[PDB]
């Protein structure tokens, strides 16, 4: 997250870190949202590689013991069947991970609230992206979880010529684009939390930014629109 602030430890308890095994260690690669005690929602592109993945819940600082983390392997990966790695702009950038064990809920570990199917947010709706992604374009991952306030940019504006044009689809949510704040590599798969009727819900799964840079004016961060996939999500969890 570029132009973020450090999140308080208990603000976003559904945020997870998706990590891959690298030598004798683990490396953060993406975020995700815990949606059941044994299921995580993340981006399909995060799990394109044939890697060993683990999920960490109750994480705050990737480089220090927080005394709250739970570590669990990924037992099964279900990518949306229409996802195509060669075409992020087509959409369908979503995947569900079934965890090898069910994690224990507490003030640091909670399920993310998903919007009802079909919900669209009004333009300029208040949302926060969270994650450990790069803090600058071509920078480095954050140590501590960051949040940035990124109001939505509705489909009409986002798909206009000055913004993303036809690269953005109505199955996506755009947010930010101010040139200062944005998601960045390593935030992919994580949540966009939006305040609606007094309660934050996870409306987006971070998907992409401009090839030009993370914080680019009129290139808001783009997220898979969660509310476009509610049936798909329920279907997978029920059959797995």
């Amino acid at each position: 997250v570029v132009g973020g602030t450090e999140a308080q430890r208990n603000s976003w308890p559904s945020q997870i870190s998706l990590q891959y095994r690298s030598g004798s260690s683990w490396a953060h690669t993406c975020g995700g949202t815990l949606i059941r005690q044994n299921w995580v929602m993340t981006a399909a592109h995060c799990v394109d590689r044939e890697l060993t993945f683990r999920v960490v819940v109750g994480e705050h600082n990737l480089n220090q013991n927080n005394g709250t983390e739970q570590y669990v392997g990924v037992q099964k990966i279900v990518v949306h069947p229409y996802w195509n790695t060669d075409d992020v702009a087509a959409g369908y950038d979503i995947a569900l991970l079934r965890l090898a064990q069910s994690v224990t809920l507490n003030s640091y570990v909670q399920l993310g609230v998903l919007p009802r199917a079909g919900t669209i947010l009004a333009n300029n709706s208040p949302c926060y992206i969270t994650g450990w992604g790069l803090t600058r374009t071509n920078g480095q991952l954050a140590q501590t979880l960051q949040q940035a306030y990124l109001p939505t940019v509705d489909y009409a504006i986002c798909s206009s010529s000055s913004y993303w044009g036809s690269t953005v689809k109505n199955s996506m949510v755009c947010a930010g684009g101010d040139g200062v704040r944005s998601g960045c590599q390593g935030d992919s798969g994580g949540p966009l939390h939006c305040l609606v009727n007094g309660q934050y819900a996870v409306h987006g799964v971070t998907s992409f930014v401009s090839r030009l840079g993370c914080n680019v004016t009129r290139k808001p961060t783009v997220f898979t629109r969660v509310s476009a996939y509610i049936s798909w999500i329920n279907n997978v969890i029920a059959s797995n």
Partner: peptide, 4 residues
């Protein structure tokens, strides 16, 4: 488009 850049996957992040």
């Amino acid at each position: 488009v850049e996957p992040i």
